[PDB]
């Protein structure tokens, strides 16, 4: 997978997109703990657009 | 004979009577 280090209060932000996006089967493939998540490789550049509202 | 003496095994003519029967009843 793709190791992504984040904030514990921000981990659930990517989980809400998993239950909303209907592109693939499941966005998050393995949730290690509160500061480490995994992902099919393709949405880091798309997430940069959501920084303006975050 | 002084240390650990065993009473020798004697055969019974009818062994079920001394095996199966209760003695305190």
């Amino acid at each position: 997978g793709v190791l992504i280090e984040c904030d514990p209060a921000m981990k659930q932000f990517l989980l809400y997109l998993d239950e909303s996006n209907a592109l693939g089967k499941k966005f998050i493939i393995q949730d290690i703990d509160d500061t480490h998540v995994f992902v099919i490789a393709e949405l880091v550049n798309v997430l940069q657009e959501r920084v303006g509202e975050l | 004979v002084s240390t650990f003496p065993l009473i020798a095994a004697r055969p019974f003519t009818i062994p079920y009577l001394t095996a199966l029967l209760p003695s305190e009843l």
Partner: protein, 963 residues
Amino acid sequence: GFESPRPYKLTHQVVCINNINFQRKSVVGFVELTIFPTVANLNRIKLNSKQCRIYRVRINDLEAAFIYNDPTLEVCHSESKQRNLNYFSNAYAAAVSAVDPDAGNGELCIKVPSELWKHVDELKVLKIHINFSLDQPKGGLHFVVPSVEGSMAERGAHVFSCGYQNSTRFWFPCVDSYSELCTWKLEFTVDAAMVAVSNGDLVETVYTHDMRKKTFHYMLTIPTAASNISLAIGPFEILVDPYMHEVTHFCLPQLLPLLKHTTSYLHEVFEFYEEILTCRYPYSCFKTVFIDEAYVEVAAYASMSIFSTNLLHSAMIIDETPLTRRCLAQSLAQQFFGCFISRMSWSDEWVLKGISGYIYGLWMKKTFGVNEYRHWIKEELDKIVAYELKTGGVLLHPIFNPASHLHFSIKHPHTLSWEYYSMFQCKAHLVMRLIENRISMEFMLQVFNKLLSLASTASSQKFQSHMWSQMLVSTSGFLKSISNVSGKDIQPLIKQWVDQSGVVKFYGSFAFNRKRNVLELEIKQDYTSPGTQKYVGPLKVTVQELDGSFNHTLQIEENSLKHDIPCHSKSRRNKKKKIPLMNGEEVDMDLSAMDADSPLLWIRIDPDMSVLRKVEFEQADFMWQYQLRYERDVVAQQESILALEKFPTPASRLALTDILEQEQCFYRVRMSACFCLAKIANSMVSTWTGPPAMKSLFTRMFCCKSCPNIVKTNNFMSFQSYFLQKTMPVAMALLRDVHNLCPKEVLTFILDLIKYNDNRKNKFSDNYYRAEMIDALANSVTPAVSVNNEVRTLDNLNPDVRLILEEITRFLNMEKLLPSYRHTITVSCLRAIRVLQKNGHVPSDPALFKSYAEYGHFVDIRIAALEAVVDYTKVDRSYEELQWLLNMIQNDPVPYVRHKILNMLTKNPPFTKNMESPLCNEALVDQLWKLMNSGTSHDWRLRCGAVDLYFTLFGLSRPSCLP
């Protein structure tokens, strides 16, 4: 449809026995058969007879000529130099087939006189009057004559018919097949102080003109075979059952209170077997005879059962009540389905053995609970998968060799090995449980009721077998009755588990796909092992996830490997809610050990044991701990205990300790958790924190609150903490320190359990608990550190072993003055002395066990001492002890002891075929070949045991250690 292999049909048989001489061990009598020839030109009539001296034979009061020859007396010639076992097995199968009444053959060939040929061509009756004499029988009738003086009733001398299957040829001439049904008239002229018990109902008992002897007349109007006819003559104490009044119980003298207490349960067994089936008990009486030096522990004949007296216990004896209870129950099950409904061939024996074992398992389910039923079914299934993976497989219903992977022929019951016979009955009742799984239990009981109802409409006709063959079941008739009552046929299940002779092996491993929320199982079979076969049917799997327990059916075709099943939510980890179980209840689980991404808590492949299988599933250790704690199935708790021995983590120690502390767990799971906790504790030394395992738990459960090292006085009225209390030090003694020696904290604890034992207050005996204490003392013995092979004397004894030796000396000597119930402490102390001799503590001398293996001792002491002598002659390579054991096989009075010596010398052999030993002479090969050929010619169970011993020692080919 049944067509006879015999050219005649036997209608009636009179068996008259006079002059039973107990001093000379001799009977005289006659036999009068009433045959109807079915083919004209009958000429010779072939009957079965062993050991009887035939004096004269008269056919229709005309003197006839007979010729007798028994090919099974010496199977191969004495001057043949063959020494391989396949030659003997083929010759023994041919010899048994040459005396087989299931073919047309027989041992006594009587020639019909010439003037009766016009009486035999137009098919009219023939009455054959043989009179015979048993001079000193080596088989069939066993004479137990004690050597106390007095009259034969005052010393306790008795006779009983022993043997298995068709062994009635050993005491009168008959047609000794299960398919020749006839009515019977049985007269026995015995002493006036004795009683003669046999099959049928006693019509009268007349005195002789001197009033010193009396004749018992029995009549059997239900047509039985000759193989179901028995006899017990002795000075028996008669007891009529106070609940059922056609049932009489006979015991040996001075054992009437034990008989009263022991046979007081049997009316409930009668009521069970008559309410699950809807037929009443078919015979007009029932007789239970308890005897000494029995052949088997329980034998069942027509309207009669012969048990050994060693089943008789009093009211204060526990740990023997369930065993005697289930012996009575399986004798009654065989009364229904081995003696009333009989066998059509030697094939279709699996039907009768399966119905007997299956209804006895239904009795065990109702009596001892569903959990004891599941534990029994699992132990039988483990037994058969161990035996079938060990050697070939058991083939129910062969077709006539069909099974050539094993060293004997399966065409006849008297060529089977005894372990094969035991596993045959075991597999038959498990396959009947499988047929109940496919076709529901009420339809199964309707099948059995239809068979019994056909037999009981058949049993009242007088036509000579026009209708008496509806009392004989076959495989095709059983499958046709199943198809009649249900509309489903079981021919794939019959083809897989009966006709094919193998069990299946499952290797499973899972992986949870988090993305698609599925569970990918991976089940592969090992089908290239010698005992295995390939399963292609459906397979149930039970997955416990956080949302509950869900069952899934998997189709496991030949090319299948990955099975994707769907998984449910994990919303019972979001809120704390209770997780619902396999039953309707729900519990609080500690979900800290579970993975965060997977909802599934445990997986069980084939939970209901619906195939004959051995599962090897690869779960994670927390899944095994959850399955041990929160499962509502005892076989899954047992398999999780068995799989937790590979994970010695402290969470598994906490799981087994929580199982041990928990009443409302089944007690046989806690008794297994003791030994599992001992093994785990031995594996995590140099990590264990506090006291030794189970000690604090023993002092918390079974000792005083004010004194921790003083045990509470014995009150054994709970029967589950009694079993747990007597099994916990036995497992606690398997604790070992870093130095591989048992700790002196556990040995001192066991010795304080022995010293502070007070049993003056409970209503139950203490013999099994004290015997288990001796077993716990024997478990603590580690091998001694002998230096330069120093002779083991009294001064250089271990300081630990001197206390153990003092205790077992005190226990054995106190048993010599105040004996136990079945000398359980003698057996435990002999076993412990053999444990001390196996390590370098006591000198390796077999003279003590050779003195306890004499004839006059109790049979449990005898078999424990002979087990010690067999272990000694394996370890010390003793020639003279092996000659002692072989001599005791040849001439011992009790044949059960001879069979047990051959059995123990097969299980623990002095050498195998791979070993070079000093005991591999041509002399030993010649002795064992003479023991197979001659010598064991009178028992049919000693000869199969000698064949098993020759196979274990020298193999299927020519003995290698030979010119």
